[PDB]
Amino acid sequence: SKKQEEGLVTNKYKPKEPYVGRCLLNTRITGDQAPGETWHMVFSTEGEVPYREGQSIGVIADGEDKNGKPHKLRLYSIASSALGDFGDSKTVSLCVKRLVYTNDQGEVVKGVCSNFLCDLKPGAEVKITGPVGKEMLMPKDPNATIIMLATGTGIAPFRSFLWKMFFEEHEDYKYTGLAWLFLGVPTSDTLLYKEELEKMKEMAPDNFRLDFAVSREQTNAAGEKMYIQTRMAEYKEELWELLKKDNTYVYMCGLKGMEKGIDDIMLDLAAKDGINWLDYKKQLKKSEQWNVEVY
Numbered sequence: 001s002k003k004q005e006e007g008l009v010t011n012k013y014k015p016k017e018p019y020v021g022r023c024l025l026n027t028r029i030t031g032d033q034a035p036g037e038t039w040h041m042v043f044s045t046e047g048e049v050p051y052r053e054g055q056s057i058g059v060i061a062d063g064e065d066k067n068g069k070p071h072k073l074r075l076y077s078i079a080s081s082a083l084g085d086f087g088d089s090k091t092v093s094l095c096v097k098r099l100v101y102t103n104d105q106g107e108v109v110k111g112v113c114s115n116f117l118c119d120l121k122p123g124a125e126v127k128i129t130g131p132v133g134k135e136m137l138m139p140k141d142p143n144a145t146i147i148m149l150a151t152g153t154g155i156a157p158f159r160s161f162l163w164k165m166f167f168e169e170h171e172d173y174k175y176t177g178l179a180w181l182f183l184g185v186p187t188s189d190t191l192l193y194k195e196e197l198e199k200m201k202e203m204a205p206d207n208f209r210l211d212f213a214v215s216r217e218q219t220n221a222a223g224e225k226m227y228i229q230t231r232m233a234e235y236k237e238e239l240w241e242l243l244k245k246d247n248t249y250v251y252m253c254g255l256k257g258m259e260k261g262i263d264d265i266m267l268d269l270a271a272k273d274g275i276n277w278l279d280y281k282k283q284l285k286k287s288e289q290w291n292v293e294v295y
């Protein structure tokens with residue numbers, strides 16, 4: 001594999017007997033004017049949960065379902081690097097969007113686990129399972145060009161990636177490649193980790209490119225809404241050229257459906273080059289250079 005799979009751990013903890021951590025910090029990272037709430041929370045793990053960049057953990061909300069059984073676990077991409085927000089390898093962090101919407105019947109639907117997580121106060125316990133997954137593991141190549149495409153909470157695994165790449169010192173992993181993050185959100189009030197990301201850009205100016213796409217507030221020169229694919233289109237020649245290099249790895253995380261718009265601009269780019277994007281994407285997936293985790 002071309003990914004950091006060495007010593008990988010999956011499901012050390014299962015629903016039947018999860019790890020019980022404690023909330024150390026819970027902070028809303030979206031503005032007051034934001035239409036929806038997203039929270040950044042840090043749980044203690046005592047160094048018992050051996051997760052790595054790109055993995056997820058399952059969370060079992062407190063309470064019971066309509067049948068008296070414990071709630072089914074919900075997966076959340078880990079937003080912290082392996083060393084964690086405190087650099088001590090004894091915590092794990094999540095980036096959670098509170099799911100609340102009204103169906104066509106006028107009935108409010110409050111997501112069970114997302115609201116449970118966002119309502120957590122420091123000191124409160126949390127049932128955790130995992131670590132989970134291997135689709136979004138980082139490339140082994142320390143000079144890899146890493147293109148990260150995210151929408152909303154999809155930023156989570158890339159915050160994890162970026163912490164290891166730019167906020168930490170690893171004698172065995174000194175990142176020298178080009179990291180490029182595209183983050184699409186509806187309003188600037190929902191620009192998750194804006195400060196952190198701009199700080200990374202400040203300390204690694206030539207190695208980190210950061211492009212925000214705020215669809216409801218920005219438009220390109222033509223006046224078109226700035227969706228993630230719209231922002232990508234501002235760099236079409238560069239991106240296509242990079243997609244042809246063997247050390248280029250593309251990761252996509254976030255709302256299912258963000259894939260279509262991205263494929264549309266890729267279809268155009270490849271075609272102009274006499275290439276069928278649908279086929280090329282299959283090849284990139286097989287060569288581990290196109291990794292997707294949408295929900």
Ligand SMILES: Cc1cc2nc3c(=O)[nH]c(=O)nc-3n(C[C@H](O)[C@H](O)[C@H](O)COP(=O)(O)OP(=O)(O)OC[C@H]3O[C@@H](n4cnc5c(N)ncnc54)[C@H](O)[C@@H]3O)c2cc1C
Pocket residue numbers: 056074075076077078095096097098099109110111112113114115153154156293294295
């Ligand atoms: C690999 C993976 C990674 C994920 N990473 C994150 C992450 O980093 N952050 C994050 O906030 N979430 C993430 N999720 C989503 C998360 O797992 C839950 O699906 C989400 O938080 C809603 O769960 P809930 O318990 O709050 O809602 P539920 O109680 O499960 O939902 C209530 C009802 O709404 C429906 N429903 C569920 N989800 C949606 C939706 N998105 N839109 C409309 N209706 C819906 C259901 O069918 C259900 O009947 C991830 C999911 C996967 C599979």
